[model samples]
Target chain A: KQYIISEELISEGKWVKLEKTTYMDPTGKTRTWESVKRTTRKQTADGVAVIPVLQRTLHYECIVLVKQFRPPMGGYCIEFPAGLIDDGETPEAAALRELEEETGYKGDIAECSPAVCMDPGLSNCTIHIVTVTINGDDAENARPKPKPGDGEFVEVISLPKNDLLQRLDALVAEEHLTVDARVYSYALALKHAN
Target chain B: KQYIISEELISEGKWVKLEKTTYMDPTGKTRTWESVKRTTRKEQTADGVAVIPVLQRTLHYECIVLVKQFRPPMGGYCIEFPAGLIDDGETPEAAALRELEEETGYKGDIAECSPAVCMDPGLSNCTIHIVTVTINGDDAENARPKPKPGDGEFVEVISLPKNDLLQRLDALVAEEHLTVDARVYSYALALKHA
Candidate 1:
């Protein structure tokens, strides 16, 4: 049901574009799809590893959130603080490190999810969302922020436990900002019929 | 800070291959990365959509639409939500409706569509415009979604109560064999949030 249309190279750099092929499904439906691959030494691996940190605040039981600009989307996203797992460090360690560097609060891993692909159809990029537990001790009175070393524009915001779902709904409806699926997924679970 | 690498088309089927690109960080540092991407003959745009459609009268019951496919990257069967890419000039919401109907046979109005949630921001330029649709009880009872023999895309449908979503999710993974990001994140977070 599928066949090649025309193949050509579009461009390259942080991203690689290939003018691709054509294919038909069982129903005789077909398409002319393309490819855009992330290229940067750090982005490639047979098993791409990432970590999403789910941190609840000690003082308010609020969800610790990070707002950063995603280049491709050209907008900021309210997502769980996350990053790639470097060669030596484990996924838990990477999650912990990303949490500290991006939000400056220290915490222990409460639960580390098994690795799962976020979009297998696109790429084999997998993540282990590590939930961290923080109590009263893990705070800075100065209201800590991302370090210069973090190298991105990230704002650390906290959503209070009460009415968190409402708040998420408000953001999606009004801000036009991308809310990380993992974050929204958390909110959906919490707000589901109890 | 950006790189222009040697891009090449590997094969002409579901995936396209390219040599690669370099990502520049705010620190002015860059790195090398490589990749792969998936698309269909019906979706030339490459953008995809996923819905978390819920049953209305008893909001507790939601449709757990699962995609069963032999994902090349994962090397075996992977279970995920019903999804498909955007076709020529179609809105994400429209793309979602088309796929949902094609795969599940049940129709749903766009309930809550989230901002483009980058499933894997680092690997590929692929995203599933996250959505939630609604299907009534009668619609639920008579629906029969068959896996197309030619396409090899088998969709397994399950009705889940908000309370038991976590349990069912685990069974699908532990018993059914594989799982994907969008589907797992929603179910996992829903349980944790609950």
Candidate 2:
């Protein structure tokens, strides 16, 4: 159904490589594609190979110091701790690491579900939904911590889960959280929480 | 603010032109992107740009189609129509065109509230959502006049408006429509329909 015509390394770098792909489709149509690949490995398959960017989510009981900032939309947005999957890390591990690093909360990752953070688009990222249940005392003891890598900032806010959903719904209605972290995170919460 | 770095011609073709962009992020981070632009003479800023690939639904509807064979799952799967964006066209127009083109069904286009198709990390493409109402009689009449181009071979199936939220919940529970098209479509539909 598919045939490879030729491939050439356009450029190679420490992290990613650019390659040109010429192929024949099932209808015998010829096509070419330029793709980037993590250079640490060699080609295992003949066609396009994609690695879903890893993602993690950290959930907690209603608490303070868990700030939600307006992302993409300029307003206060509420969200649990979450982060992108670093190279070579599982989603569960990423969730655990981000929860502690971002919220200073330590809890067993009680549940996790495989999820696609962004799908059916060029954004080939995957996320794991992780639930970190913390008791009232533990949540109270938790403090915010600074992330090491990006120019990260944090503010803490807390509200009831239903209330939080209400706010999110309002934002969604107003097109405030039209595109960004809060929207997807809210979808994940709605998926599992209720 | 965003700064344009450089633009280079990638491909010269009839309907499409590929361009490489180097831009500076708000934080002064430099990144490069490749984008496909539809060629039109209406002038760059004056004319509306063509829609990218990927389609999402604003309100929820039950999409029913005979499952086609695909890989990764390696089986023919029944699904609703979630497609890549309509290149060189607006979301609604393209959705209508593609629906008829791909499925041989001519439907009156309905403007659904558009949502941001999540950007994928692996590819340089954009997706949009489209909603339409099908005229079964019109579609049936048109079907005999002109055949579809390419492998556009699928039988007409049923489409129903369902409780978007409940359908999404059911999909999540059954792992049926796990892809972005189903998830985002369901969310948009629930938000509007529910």
Candidate 3:
């Protein structure tokens, strides 16, 4: 059975590390696999996380989203405005702020769910979720635009709510786009839940 | 646009690492985020990739397979789709079949696959390719499947009729001992295709 022997904080800054996990192989042999972990920002402490608001627009009956080039994936990623929760910020507040900051749209948090690990096997990152409701306003206000380029490098996208699953799936097949698992899964649940 | 300036390999173990990455943020200011690397294959760059197999037998997802094991990081059992690293030259479909057979002991045909997904973009440079799986003929029950030997530390395999997965997950959660991974949990929530 492979197991961790010891790990250390090799370096500190944006990323955190726990390297050289020693494993006692099934045959009493030993080996190690290299691993590195990037914890949430220090300001957030333990990486409690959240995606941006899931704003449902009253006018178009669509979802407001962001499409940005993710350096890690070497392509564009289609997901809601997502980021770390600020030090003193609540999840709902973070969700609303991130939505407005990332997409330049105004919305209110309709509902916010508890935190869940975004990827347990990958890292100890937590993401808070919220449902956002956007009022049907003037056509000029319904549009999306970036707020002078700050955090995420994304193109604002809003799609009819009913088209989310098909569209997200299509994006992957057509444009080779990458969607966050949480985004896809969340949509799937909402689409198919009894 | 944010740009990567520098990356350095630090550790070699189950989790690999880049000691540091200097990035020119969207503001055109440089900052370093220490990063971690747990790659798809033994010998691969830190740009990680994985395959998520949602195995189905015929129209029924009765064969939907989940592996449960104690995650050191989570400090508890995590239920997740049968997934694994793609070998150096394996395609996503091939990798999905290989991993499903190893983790759940099921052998099946590839049905459909979605494009690559950025599983975790905030912390690491990792992405997962998703594939749907199926068994042909009467192979659904006739197929030879058992937890392959030498598999990692997974301790339990959970299978339910296509309909009861969500309830089972709820029961497990009500027990409050098992933790659900967000991706799998999302699928569970929307099985009905609402």
Candidate 4:
């Protein structure tokens, strides 16, 4: 059994509240927890974020690269273009927008897939996934057009899928790319290209 | 070439802040973005928060039931246990404390895995895997001791590694477990279970 014993706003400015709960354990010992829910902007169900994976039909297709120096990693690393979902924007829309903004490729979003991305142990947020099908022509037409607002000085480098995979593996071995980005991009490549 | 641009706080609240930036695109187009950053706690870096994966190795193992749930096109759904990140706390220490408080039988933190978890394009954010190894004696002693806060009221049906793998693989190949939990657990057991 469980019950919400009490809840109160602990800090109004910070949007933090403390919630108390009482429950019975297996041995019948009374237990309690003071849970904290920090208030923040809640996106609409559909407005949840997404990660975009772009691919070509043939093997050794192009690989999207964003070159930015990470403060934590203390160096520049390559990663796939990703962004949050805009209000009313579908995952496909967000992916397409991110791709064009980062790489300047205006292509239709095709073959979208869904996935949840989160370390549920740390946060309640989830990320959606969208993979776009960009043909050879579209890939060639897509060029790096780094914008001022982009998080870093992003250099878009399109390489063969196999070569990109090799580079990604090397980065992992060297501990360059963050674990999350490294794993996410490689998994997408394996699923789509391999 | 890329250039470092300044940053500004877009929206500020207790848990997170939406940071906005202005950058020049490759073709010289001015672009802007609003990024979400966790504010409830300070991060080691400005780009994103860090996630630590917790794992425990032991003679006795614990596997949550894999349930099969149905998808509209996939006829019948499969089954999988509920398992995910150990969030809700700033440090893994805090998270472990909370999890143990709820799990009760848990003794303390164990080994930390190197490659925590790999995520695909479908899901947002990141997935960090953590495992708690319990001995047979501990399992028996803690069996159905009590349900933790935020945990659902479903009974946990345990199984050995071999039996669990067979059921999970069968469900996966049959498209019974399309969701994240079953898929990950099935793969983990197939690779790790001897």
Q: For every candidate, what share of the true interface contacts is present? A: 0.38, 0.07, 0.49, 0.03
Docking class of 1: acceptable
The weakest ten consecutive residues by lDDT in model 3 chain B span B44-53
Best by DockQ: 3
Candidate 3 structure, TM-score to reference: 0.76
Model 1, A91-174: lDDT tens digits are 777776777777776667766655676665544456676767555344462465456244465777678655666787787688
Model 1 chain B weakest lDDT span, ten residues long: B1-10
Candidate 3 vs candidate 4: the TM-score winner is 3
DockQ of 1: 0.28
Instruction: Assess every candidate by TM-score.
Output: 0.71, 0.50, 0.76, 0.46
Q: What would the per-residue lDDT of candidate 3 be over residues B1-194, giving only the tens digit for each residue?
A: 65678776665444544546567766687766555556444443223323334445565544456777655554445777777667786777777888777777777677666555667665566766666675442464536567773544454667754467657876776786666676765566446323
Cα lDDT of model 3 by residue, A16-75, tens digit: 656444445445665544434555444322332233333343543666667765545444
- Arrange candidates by DockQ, descending: 3, 1, 2, 4
DockQ of each: 0.28, 0.14, 0.41, 0.09
Candidate 1 Cα lDDT to native? 0.57
RMSD of each: 6.5, 9.1, 4.7, 10.0
Give the C-alpha lDDT of model 4. Answer: 0.39
Scoring the B chain of model 3 against the true B chain gives a TM-score of 0.79
Misplaced by over 4 Å in model 2 are A1-7, A12-18, A27-30, A36-88, A99-137, A140-142, A146-148, A151-194, B1-81, B87-97, B100-111, B121-127, B130-194
Classified by CAPRI criteria, candidate 2 counts as: incorrect
lDDT of 2 by residue, A1-194 (tens): 44457766665544434556565555666765453434443221111111111122354335222333322212233345566566666666776677666655555655554343333111123345455554435543344354534533444444334344455445456744322332333343343221
Per-candidate chain B TM = 0.74, 0.45, 0.79, 0.44
Which regions in candidate 4 have their CA more than 4 angstroms from the true location?
A1-59, A70-78, A139-144, A148-152, A157-165, A181-194, B1-194
